[PDB]
């Protein structure tokens, strides 16, 4: 037992030494010659109303016209963002929802929460209604985020240190990922649809490969828990936020930390993070009752998109990159460009 | 208008959905939500009987609709999940009396720590608590042979049931630190009739009256 | 059992080929410069064609 | 999904007649309902429209004020009532569904029609018969009188088919799309005010009468019909 | 001399107009205030806003420079003024009754659904009764018998018509407001010291303001119109008793609507 612990400590020291030897130059000394974006301002173009309680998640479609939103009233709504209309309203069985997803083929949606069950709904039928296609069960805690991998494969992460991959048609798990110690809060699929990364309540993140099931790599460094993770457009980076008023930029190949986004006047929490269509703007949702826009390569700018009367809890960006949607606890949803 | 027929049909659809949503939401703000809490094996099963994931129980009493939520099945950290209960009318807390000597560090001190952590939480600075003390028969039949100094050295009172009950109740109620904003109600868990629901009905009526008056700056 | 699993996991995570940080920084800034004309939130679109 | 109509018959001049439609197998409270007419040996003709919520009711420019349209939601029954019938209303009638939101496909399911016997942008079909041979490519074109590309970017022409002794089924909706249950060997395109449909690799059960409609604004106008025969 | 008086009257008129325009805007902007209290507050705001539009400015020439107005303007002026004042008082009473039902029965108040038409029914019955109180008798005023005088009602000759009007517009509202506020306090009394003191103070203010601002003019009119019909000189007492009545419409938008927390949030939203 002692020999195993000594070997583990030696391996950790060797990994740290290799990482230190792999760090030669920093990007903070390269972007000093880059012209900044300058002042960036945005204006409310539409305002979507109809929700009553808070808003916990939202997700864009694959064509940048249709929208999905989930509230604590046990309500799911499908909107059109070009004319401010309602295309569908879906009821729910459990009013405690914390995540949603939109199928890339425009056919299915998903919901989940504190009931430990993931519900999958089918949109296009012959009777004109929306029906409950599947109920996936097998977790023991609570679901935090669900994404559609393809039209017949789904991925879930829970608060039992477990991530799972499901085959919808069968109804049964095909692979399970374990190795965390605390709650898991986020995951973000890659464009090539072969890997995914997840962050835990223990100031750590892990990168996983789907086909095999073996944990690929582990990153640490935050002072406290990690609450939001997004994923870079090219598939070779990601950025995370903690409940410490701090954001970080990690890479999957250099195996080290790159940039830190923090400021002395910010002492609240971070609830969501997203990128832009060219990897030049980073949008963050804080608890100061406003959002923020960061220059992803220079790590200094504070272009507040204020306008909410409570905490901003979700945001998203279109596929063509021509709008930004924000949702907060004030029961309204706003569109920016 | 400058629209085709199909767009007019679309806006009619949207208006109809809006009406349905408003009706449902208005019908959904006419009910009482209570959150249950207690220590491990505190007898709260008796409370549920007399009246995985989240367990939701429903009942209707004297023209009110009560939703009780039981959260005992969860085992994760309570910090990242407790915020979704900001709008509750009341927190029910259940504590055991006949577990002062059993050590798991007895049960009484763990219950005290849990109460002191819950009552001063930031999300619950205006939410009332209903406190149940239960398992009193074994308590009355246990102090005839065991002294209260086994866990309360400072106690110097009579070896009678009433003095013990009063001391325990005052010790618990002394934990509050927001005396000007929210109250605390106490009751000994009965086992012979339907008082355990009447007490909650009275508590929620009083909470409604005080919220109504204090929302008007009166 | 736990010690053996930890040893195996650390051994699997220890043998990984790596590259320098400057290469990653260069790749990121290259991709940033490569799409400077197709981002509707850095260079605004004329109002004649903007849906919003 | 099954709509069945009833009520047809023989009537003397004048009098009255009520026709009913019964639905089974879908949500009757999210679909608007049209009545369409077909002459004994001519093209189709638009008649009436009733919508979701009973808010909007249109009528024909010919017999407005003489026809009565109504719906009953809990029992799922659609009613038409007519009085004082002349000789111009000896024909067959069809009930059609439509639902309008972003992405839908109107005029999807038709009925079986009923028979009644009594003792404006211009659509004109170009031809009347085209003899063909299996394995050949066919183009069928019709014409209009004003532009159909609405400002928002749509196009509102409909291409329908009819085999012998049957009821129509939607081939192309909004002049460029493909419906459900239809073989993937069809196409349709047009240059403003004149349009053409293309069929490749002909086969049996693909011979009959083709029709082209508009829906830019009420009322809607029909054509004579193109007969494709072997 | 005239300049200062004109400036002060203009200031009062603008103060009333702004004070009620704020409330009207607050209701218009916010859509989450679809309850009974906001409806009644809006009714009060409409009445008090019209109070200061027709009455004060046109009155300024009637008593400052020259009466080029005639009978056709005098009757209109009188009818408008009386209707508006009575409407404001009855709105105060209705708000009091709503608040009392908010505490005499909470269960049946939380579980009702009437929010469509009974509200407008009551809102219109208020104005109907407000007209019916004073319109007929003031429209049957022709017994001046002297061409050329001020613009005052025709029933200041007999004391048995002033008394009933002052009895069915002043005494009953005061009795009812006092009774409702006492029920509220006695019910909510059953930590304690500060709350009891604060709430007793609040209710005492909300009744004393109304009583003081509406008693003296009625008292002076009845005493001067019973026996000693002094229809000529009028001292400063009468001229201050006339002005005190309208000063209630300045205070009212500060006590009832603004104290509410929802309206403070709505105002902060603008
Ligand atoms: N007598 C009309 C009400 C009034 C008196 N003074 C001012 N307004």
- Taking the CA of residue E153 as reference, the ligand 1 atom at the shortest distance is 1
Q: Are D197 and D175 in contact (CB under 8 A)?
A: no
Residue to probe by mutation, ligand 1, list E60, E81, E141, E222, most atoms within 8 Å of CB:
E81
- Contacts of residue E18, defined as CB under 8 A and 6 or more positions apart, other chains included, come to none
Angle between helix axes E71-104 and B195-215 (nearest 10 degrees) is 150
Last residue of a domain, one of D72, D96, D118: D118
Distances (CA, A) of B81 to A186, B56, B88: 15, 16, 14
Give the number of other Cβ atoms within 10 Å of residue E270's Cβ.
9
Calculate how far, in angstroms, residue E53's C-alpha sits from the geometric centre of ligand 1: 15
| 3-class DSSP assignment, residue A169 | coil
The class of domain C1-52 in CATH terms is few secondary structures
Q: Is the peptide bond before D109 cis (omega within 30 degrees of 0)?
A: no
3-state secondary structure chain B: CCCCHHHHHHHHHHHHHHHHHHHHHHHCCCCEEEEEEECCCCCHHHHHHHCCCCEEEEEEECCEEEEEEECCCCCCCCCCCHHHHCCCCEEEEEEECCCCCCECCEHHHHHHHHHHHHHCCHHHCCCEEEEEEECCHHHHCCCCCCCHHHCCCCCCCCCCHHHHHHHHHHHHHCCCCCCCCCCEEEEECCCCCCHHHHHHHHHHHHHHHHHHHHHCCC
B25 touches chain A (CB under 8 A): yes
List the domain boundaries for chain B: 35-208
Chain E residue closest to B205 (CA)?
A: E106
Answer whether C touches E (≥3 Cβ pairs < 8 Å): no
Contact state of B77 with A183 under an 8 Å Cβ cutoff: yes
- For residue E247, give the nearest of E51, E80, E64 by alpha carbon: E51
DSSP state, residue D74 = T
Radius of gyration of chain E (CA): 21
Pick the CATH number of B35-208 from 3.40.720.10, 2.30.40.10, 3.40.50.300, 3.40.50.970: 3.40.50.300
Helical (H) or strand (E) element with E124: helix E118-139
Q: Are A243 and B80 in contact (CB under 8 A)?
A: no
Contact state of A73 with B28 under an 8 Å Cβ cutoff: yes
Sign, Cα dihedral of B99, B104, B108, B114: negative
Nearest Cβ partner for B217 among E108, E187, E260: E260
E245 C-beta closer than 6 A to ligand 1: yes
Instruction: Please identify among residues 97-136 of chain D the ones whose CB lies closer than 8 Å to any CB of chain A.
Output: 99, 101-103
Query: Which pair of tokens denotes residue E242?
Result: 């006339």
Sign, Cα dihedral of E20, E25, E26, E31: positive
What is the DSSP track for E188-239?
A: HH--HHHHHHHHHHHHHHHHHHHHHHHHHHHHHHHHHHHT----S---HHHH
Beta bridge partners of A85: A80
Chain C residue closest to A208 (CA)?
A: C13
Radius of gyration of chain D (CA): 18
Beta bridge partners of A120: A110, A134
- For residue E252, give the nearest of E88, E73, E101, E104 by alpha carbon: E88
Nearest Cβ partner for B80 among A86, A87, A183: A183
Q: Are D218 and D128 in contact (CB under 8 A)?
A: no
Last residue of a domain, one of D83, D118, D153: D118
Going across the sheet that includes A143-150, the strands are A143-150, A153-158, A162-167, A172-178
- For residue D106, give the nearest of D56, D33, D162 by alpha carbon: D33
**For residues E27 and E40, what is the distance between their CA atoms, to the nearest angstrom?**
11
**For residues E214 and E217, what is the distance between their CA atoms, to the nearest angstrom?**
7
Calculate how far, in angstroms, residue A230's C-alpha sits from the geometric centre of ligand 1: 70
Distances (CA, A) of A182 to A162, A253, D61, E144: 9, 25, 72, 92
The CATH number of the structural domain formed by E2-268 is: 1.20.1070.10
List the domain boundaries for chain C: 1-52
What b-and-e string marks burial along A212-245, b requiring 16 or more CB atoms within 10 Å of the CB? eeebbbbbeebeebbbbbbbbeeebbbbbbbbbb
Chain C residue closest to A44 (CA)?
A: C52
DSSP state, residue A32 = G
What is the DSSP track for chain C?
A: -HHHHHHHHHHHHH------HHHHHHHHHHHHHHTTTS-TTTSPPPTTT---
DSSP state, residue E8 = H
- For residue A66, give the nearest of A79, A75, A76, A77 by alpha carbon: A79
DSSP state, residue A127 = S
Pairing label, strands B184-188, B128-134: parallel
Contact state of A337 with C32 under an 8 Å Cβ cutoff: no
E132 exposed, middle or buried (CB, 10 Å; 0-12, 13-18, 19+)? exposed
**For residues D29 and D48, what is the distance between their CA atoms, to the nearest angstrom?**
18
List the domain boundaries for chain E: 2-268
**For residues B53 and B70, what is the distance between their CA atoms, to the nearest angstrom?**
9
Give the number of other Cβ atoms within 10 Å of residue D112's Cβ.
14
Q: What is the domain range of residue D13? A: 2-118
List the domain boundaries for chain A: 1-336
Helical (H) or strand (E) element with E82: helix E71-104
Helical (H) or strand (E) element with A158: strand A153-158
Query: Which pair of tokens denotes residue A328?
Result: 């907060």
**For residues A226 and A200, what is the distance between their CA atoms, to the nearest angstrom?**
6
Q: Are E96 and E176 in contact (CB under 8 A)?
A: yes
Task: Tabulate helix, strand, coil % of chain E (nearest 5).
Answer: 80, 0, 20
**For residues B67 and B204, what is the distance between their CA atoms, to the nearest angstrom?**
13
What is the DSSP track for A66-99?
A: EEEEEETTTEEEEEETTTTEEEEEEE-S-S-EEE
Same domain, D32 and D112: yes
- Contacts of residue E95, defined as CB under 8 A and 6 or more positions apart, other chains included, come to E37, E40, E41, E44, E256
Query: Which pair of tokens denotes residue B4?
Result: 């085709």
CA nearest ligand 1 atom 2, residue: E82
Q: Are A170 and A207 in contact (CB under 8 A)?
A: no
What b-and-e string marks burial along A293-328, b requiring 16 or more CB atoms within 10 Å of the CB? bbbbbbbebebebebbeebbbbbbbbeebbbbbbbb
Calculate how far, in angstroms, residue B55's C-alpha sits from the geometric centre of ligand 1: 65
Contact state of A24 with C12 under an 8 Å Cβ cutoff: no
Calculate how far, in angstroms, residue E245's C-alpha sits from the geometric centre of ligand 1: 6
Report the alpha-carbon angle B170-B174-B177, nearest 5. Answer: 155
Give the count of domains, chain D. Answer: 2
Nearest Cβ partner for A253 among C14, C19, C35: C19
**Within D10-138, where are the H helices?**
none
Query: Which pair of tokens denotes residue A236?
Result: 């070779």
Last residue of a domain, one of D88, D118, D148: D118
DSSP state, residue A27 = G
Query: Which pair of tokens denotes residue B79?
Result: 């910090």
Quickly tell me which residue has 């826009």 as its tokens: A293
**For residues E183 and E102, what is the distance between their CA atoms, to the nearest angstrom?**
11
A167 exposed, middle or buried (CB, 10 Å; 0-12, 13-18, 19+)? middle
- For residue E103, give the nearest of E37, E214, E184, E173 by alpha carbon: E184
State the maximum Cα–Cα separation within chain D, in Å, rounded to a whole number: 53
Same domain, D132 and D218: yes
Q: Which CATH architecture has domain A1-336?
A: 7 Propeller (2.130)
Report the alpha-carbon angle A191-A195-A197, nearest 5. Answer: 100
Q: Are A81 and A46 in contact (CB under 8 A)?
A: yes
Beta bridge partners of A143: A158
Residue to probe by mutation, ligand 1, list E9, E162, E246, E250, most atoms within 8 Å of CB:
E246
E82 C-beta closer than 6 A to ligand 1: yes
Distances (CA, A) of A327 to A49, A286, E63, E237: 11, 12, 60, 62
């Amino acid at each position: 037992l002692d020999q195993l612990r000594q070997e583990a400590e030696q391996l950790k020291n060797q990994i740290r030494d290799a990482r230190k030897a792999c760090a030669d130059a920093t990007l903070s000394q390269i972007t000093n010659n880059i012209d900044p974006v300058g002042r960036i301002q945005m204006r409310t173009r539409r305002t979507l109303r109809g929700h009553l309680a808070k808003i916990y998640a939202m997700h864009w479609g694959t064509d940048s016209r249709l929208l999905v939103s989930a509230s604590q009233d046990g309500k799911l709504i499908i909107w059109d963002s070009y004319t401010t209309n309602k295309v569908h309203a879906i009821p729910l069985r459990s009013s405690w929802v914390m995540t949603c997803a939109y199928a890339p083929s425009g056919n299915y949606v998903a919901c989940g929460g504190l009931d430990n069950i993931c519900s999958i709904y089918n949109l296009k039928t012959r009777e004109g209604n929306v029906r409950v296609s599947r109920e996936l069960a097998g977790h023991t805690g609570y679901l935090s985020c669900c994404r559609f991998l393809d039209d017949n494969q789904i991925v879930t992460s829970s608060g039992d240190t477990t991530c799972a991959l499901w085959d919808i048609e069968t109804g049964q798990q095909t692979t399970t990922f374990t190795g965390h110690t605390g709650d898991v809060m986020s995951l973000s699929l890659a464009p090539d649809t072969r890997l995914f990364v997840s962050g835990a309540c223990d100031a750590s993140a892990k990168l996983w490969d789907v086909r095999e099931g073996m944990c690929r790599q582990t990153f640490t460094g935050h002072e406290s828990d990690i609450n939001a993770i997004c994923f870079f457009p090219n598939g070779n980076a990601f950025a995370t936020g903690s409940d410490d008023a701090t954001c970080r930029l990690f890479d999957l190949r250099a195996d080290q930390e790159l940039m830190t986004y923090s400021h002395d006047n910010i002492i609240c929490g971070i609830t969501s993070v997203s990128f832009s269509k060219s990897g030049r703007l980073l949008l963050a949702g804080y608890d100061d009752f406003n959002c923020n826009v960061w220059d992803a390569l220079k790590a200094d700018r504070a272009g507040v998109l204020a306008g909410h009367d409570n905490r901003v809890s979700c945001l998203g960006v279109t596929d063509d990159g021509m709008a930004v949607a924000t949702g907060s606890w004030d029961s309204f949803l706003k569109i920016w460009n | 208008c400058t629209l085709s027929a199909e767009d007019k049909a679309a806006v009619e659809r949207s208006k109809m959905i809006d009406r349905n949503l408003r009706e449902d939401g208005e019908k959904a703000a006419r009910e009482v939500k209570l959150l249950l809490l207690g220590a491990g094996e505190s007898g709260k099963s008796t409370i549920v009987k007399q009246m995985t994931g989240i367990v939701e129980t429903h009942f209707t009493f004297k023209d009110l609709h009560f939703k009780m939520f039981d959260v005992g099945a969860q085992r994760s950290e309570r910090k990242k999940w407790i915020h979704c209960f900001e709008g509750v009318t009341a927190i029910i807390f259940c504590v055991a009396l006949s577990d002062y000597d059993l050590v798991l560090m007895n049960r009484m001190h763990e219950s005290m720590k849990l109460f002191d952590s819950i009552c001063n939480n930031k999300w619950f600075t205006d939410t009332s608590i209903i406190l149940f003390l239960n398992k009193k028969d074994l308590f009355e039949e246990k102090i005839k042979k065991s002294p209260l100094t086994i866990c309360y050295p400072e106690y110097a009172g009579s070896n009678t049931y009433e003095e013990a009950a009063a001391y325990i109740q005052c010790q618990f109620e002394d934990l509050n630190k927001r005396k000007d904003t929210k109250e605390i109600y106490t009751h000994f868990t009965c086992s012979t009739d339907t008082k355990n629901v009447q007490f909650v009905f009275d508590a929620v009526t009083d909470v409604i009256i005080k919220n109504n008056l204090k929302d008007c700056g009166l | 059992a736990q010690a053996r699993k930890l040893v195996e996991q650390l051994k699997m995570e220890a043998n990984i080929d790596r590259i320098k940080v400057s290469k990653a920084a260069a790749d990121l800034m290259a991709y940033c410069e490569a799409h400077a004309k197709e981002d509707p939130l850095l260079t605004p679109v004329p109002a004649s064609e903007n849906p919003f | 999904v099954q709509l069945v109509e009833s009520g047809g018959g023989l009537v003397q001049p004048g009098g009255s007649r009520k026709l009913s439609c019964s639905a089974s197998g879908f949500a009757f409270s999210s679909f608007g309902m049209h009545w369409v007419r077909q002459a004994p040996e001519k093209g189709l003709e638009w008649v009436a429209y009733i919508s979701s919520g009973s808010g909007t009711i249109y009528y024909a420019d010919t017999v407005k004020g003489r026809f009565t349209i109504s719906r009953d939601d809990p029992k799922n029954t659609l009613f038409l009532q007519m009085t004082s019938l002349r000789s111009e209303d000896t024909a067959m009638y069809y009930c059609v569904r439509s639902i309008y939101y972003y992405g839908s496909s109107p005029f999807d399911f038709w009925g079986q029609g009923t028979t009644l016997t009594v003792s404006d942008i211009v659509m004109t079909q170009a031809t009347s018969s085209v003899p063909v041979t299996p394995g050949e490519s066919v183009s069928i074109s019709c014409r209009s009188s004003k532009s159909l590309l609405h400002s928002n970017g749509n196009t509102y022409l409909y291409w329908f088919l009819q085999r012998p002794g049957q009821s129509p089924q939607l081939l192309i909706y909004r002049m460029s799309n493909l419906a459900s249950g239809v073989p993937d060997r069809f196409s349709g395109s047009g240059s403003g005010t004149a349009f053409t449909l293309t069929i490749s690799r002909l086969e049996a059960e693909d011979v009959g009468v083709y029709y082209c409609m508009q829906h830019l604004e009420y009322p809607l106008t029909f054509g004579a019909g193109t007969k494709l025969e072997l | 001399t005239r300049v200062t008086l004109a400036f002060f009257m203009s200031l009062v008129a603008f103060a009333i107009m702004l004070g009620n325009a704020l409330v009207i805007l607050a209701f218009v902007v916010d859509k989450n205030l679809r309850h009974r209290s906001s409806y009644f507050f809006l009714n009060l705001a409409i009445s008090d806003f019209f109070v200061g539009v027709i009455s004060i400015p046109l009155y300024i020439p009637h008593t400052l420079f020259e009466w080029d107005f005639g009978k056709e303007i005098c009757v209109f002026w009188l009818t408008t003024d009386y209707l508006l004042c009575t409407a404001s008082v009855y709105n105060i009473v209705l708000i009091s009754y709503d608040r009392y039902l908010s505490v005499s029965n909470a269960v049946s108040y939380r579980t009702q659904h009437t929010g469509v038409l009974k509200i407008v029914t009551l809102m219109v019955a208020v104005w109907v009764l407000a007209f019916l109180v004073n319109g007929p008798m003031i429209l049957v005023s022709e017994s001046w018998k002297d061409e050329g005088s001020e613009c005052e009602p025709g029933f200041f000759s007999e004391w048995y018509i002033l008394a009933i009007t002052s009895f069915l517009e002043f005494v009953i509202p005061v009795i009812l407001v006092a009774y409702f506020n006492m029920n509220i306090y006695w019910s909510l009394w059953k930590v304690e010291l500060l709350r009891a003191r604060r709430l007793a103070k609040s209710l005492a203010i909300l009744l004393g303001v109304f009583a003081v601002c509406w008693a003296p003019y009625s008292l002076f009119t009845i005493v001067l119109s019973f026996y000693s019909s002094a229809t000529g000189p009028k001292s400063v007492w009468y001229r201050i008793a006339f002005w005190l009545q309208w000063f209630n419409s300045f205070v009212n938008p500060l006590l009832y609507p603004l104290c509410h927390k929802r309206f403070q949030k709505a105002f902060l939203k603008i």
